[PDB]
Amino acid sequence: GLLTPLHLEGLVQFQDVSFAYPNRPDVLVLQGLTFTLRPGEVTALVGPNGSGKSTVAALLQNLYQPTGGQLLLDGKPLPQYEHRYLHRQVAAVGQEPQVFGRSLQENIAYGLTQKPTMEEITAAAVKSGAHSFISGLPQGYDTEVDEAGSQLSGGQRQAVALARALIRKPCVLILDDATSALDANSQLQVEQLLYESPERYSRSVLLITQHLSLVEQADHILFLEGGAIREGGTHQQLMEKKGCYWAMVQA
Ligand SMILES: Nc1ncnc2c1ncn2[C@@H]1O[C@H](COP(=O)(O)OP(=O)(O)O)[C@@H](O)[C@H]1O
Ligand SMILES: [Mg+2]
């Protein structure tokens, strides 16, 4: 299939979604997940290593298909969308950023049906927390990277990957520990973009992060354990429940 609606709200619905990787079909890593991501909101996904947070992010990118249940974007199954089209609407930034052998400007504009404008490129970098280091860099945005970011540190690579995701105006944004290496100032830009930017009403967000301050501001928090959601609610509700999240916050 290949759907390409002009506008896409970014409404994500996981409906009793279960999943087992192809190479270990006998073990469900995600079990009966049901939750919704709405435009203008942020959902934080927390839990121990191996609880399935990255796997959820992988399914939302349509890298794999649910073993059970359904996952809809604007009421339609992800596969019904033209892969290129879907790849634009849904953006994911991960722990290890994908860099190219082009220039920083080309790296941020990579994968666009429309060659951007330096003003737009710069704006994406300002919001991702990349602009700053790039500016104080001899040759700035024209600077060329030696594949895999030899000259770029970890944080600089993440900030750049995030810019590439932002300049597409995704209606669905996925942050999987995408800023674990960002400096203080860039981290504030990520917070501004998630909770203060006008752009937030045009996209839903799945947030996986170690920064408990960002988590606390989330509209919804889902605690993942052994592939299943054990707790769900705002920060206060979960703190009041004094359950898994509560135990996590106060370590
Ligand atoms: N490529 C893979 N093939 C088979 N099983 C995998 C694969 N990747 C992850 N898993 C299983 O899923 C679990 C982790 O899911 P993941 O989404 O990475 O967890 P988390 O992000 O919470 O640390 C692992 O413990 C492993 O058992
Ligand atoms: Mg992970």
Swiss-Prot record:
Where do the ABC transporter domain residues begin and end?
Answer: 12-251
How would you summarize where this protein is expressed among tissues? Highly expressed in professional APCs monocytes and dendritic cells as well as in lymphocyte subsets T cells, B cells and NK cells.
* Induction annotation: Up-regulated by IFNG. Down-regulated by IL10.
| Effect noted on mutating residue 146 to G | In allele TAP1*02:01, allele TAP1*04:01 and allele TAP1*x
Phenotype for residue 157 to Q: In allele TAP1*04:01
UniProt: Mg(2+) binding residues: 54
Q: Per the record, what ranges lie on the membrane's Cytoplasmic side?
A: 1-251
- Residue positions annotated to bind ATP are 47-55, 150-156, 210
Q: Where in the cell is it found?
A: Endoplasmic reticulum membrane
Disease field reads: MHC class I deficiency 1: An autosomal recessive immunologic disorder characterized by chronic bacterial infections of the respiratory tract, beginning in the first or second decade of life and usually progressing to bronchiectasis. Patients have nasal polyps and may develop chronic necrotizing granulomatous lesions affecting the nasal cavity, upper respiratory tract, and skin.
Family from the record: Belongs to the ABC transporter superfamily. ABCB family. MHC peptide exporter (TC 3.A.1.209) subfamily.
Domain-level remarks: The peptide-binding site is shared between the cytoplasmic loops of TAP1 and TAP2.
Tell me, what does this protein do in biology? ABC transporter associated with antigen processing. In complex with TAP2 mediates unidirectional translocation of peptide antigens from cytosol to endoplasmic reticulum (ER) for loading onto MHC class I (MHCI) molecules. Uses the chemical energy of ATP to export peptides against the concentration gradient. During the transport cycle alternates between 'inward-facing' state with peptide binding site facing the cytosol to 'outward-facing' state with peptide binding site facing the ER lumen.
Q: Could you describe the subunit structure of this protein? A: Heterodimer of TAP1 and TAP2 (TAP1-TAP2). A component of the peptide loading complex (PLC), interacts via TAPBP with MHCI heterodimer; this interaction mediates peptide-MHCI assembly. Recruits TAPBP in a 1:1 stoichiometry. Interacts with classical MHCI such as HLA-A*02-B2M; this interaction is obligatory for the loading of peptide epitopes. Interacts with non-classical MHCI molecules including HLA-E-B2M and HLA-F-B2M as well as PLC component CALR before the peptide loading. Interacts with PSMB5 and PSMB8. (Microbial infection) Interacts with Epstein-Barr virus BNLF2a.
- Protein's recorded name: Antigen peptide transporter 1
Full-protein residues shown here are 492 to 742 of 748
